[PDB]
């Protein structure tokens, strides 16, 4: 945690929140998942119903391009990795409630944090 990894998704969800491409839901994450122009699409697979698990296994791992795997679970902290907070650290007093699994189109951030856990860690 005190090293230069894991903190891309913390900030790429700020630089990619600028372009408002966060297709977040059951049916309507497929909006940005009808094409592979999304790049770093986080996912979880553990609540109920066993459906979007099977959807993520096929939209993430189709035989064509766009094949990452960034499984990381526990979506109720993924709001904390998202940008719900307008923190100003001691100022927040705000909507603390959840901001769950994203589909990241239009990155906004450029090779500094992203190549750490995507390129250096996931794809060889």
């Amino acid at each position: 945690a005190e090293v230069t990894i894991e903190d891309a998704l913390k900030v790429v969800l700020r630089t990619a929140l600028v372009h408002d491409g966060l297709a977040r839901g059951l049916r309507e994450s497929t909006k940005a998942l009808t094409r592979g122009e999304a790049l770093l699409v986080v996912l979880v697979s553990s609540v109920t119903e066993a459906n979007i698990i099977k959807l993520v296994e096929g939209l993430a791992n189709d035989p064509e391009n766009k094949v990452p795997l960034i499984k990381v679970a526990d979506a109720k902290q993924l709001g904390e990795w998202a940008g719900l907070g307008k923190i100003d650290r001691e100022g927040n007093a705000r909507k603390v409630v959840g901001a769950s699994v994203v589909v990241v189109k239009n990155w906004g951030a450029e090779t500094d944090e992203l190549s750490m856990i995507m390129e250096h860690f996931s794809q060889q």
């Binding site: 059951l26 049916r27 497929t30 909006k31 009808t34 119903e49 459906n51 979007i52 099977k54 959807l55 296994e57 096929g58 939209l59 993430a60 791992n61 189709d62």
Partner: protein
């Protein structure tokens, strides 16, 4: 409120109660339950068929 993504395995999304064909938009969702009167979502190419 949907649990209708029983999908084909490994891994692509090809859907029973087949989808729509139109360049106007994505057209990657179902065309499902109809009863003496149809309603094909979006604005692709009408589709006045029987149920």
């Amino acid at each position: 409120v949907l649990s209708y993504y029983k999908v084909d395995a490994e891994g692509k999304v090809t859907k029973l109660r087949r989808e729509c064909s139109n360049p106007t938009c994505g057209a990657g969702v179902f065309l499902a339950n109809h009863k003496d009167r149809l309603y094909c979502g979006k604005c692709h190419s009408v589709y006045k068929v029987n149920a």
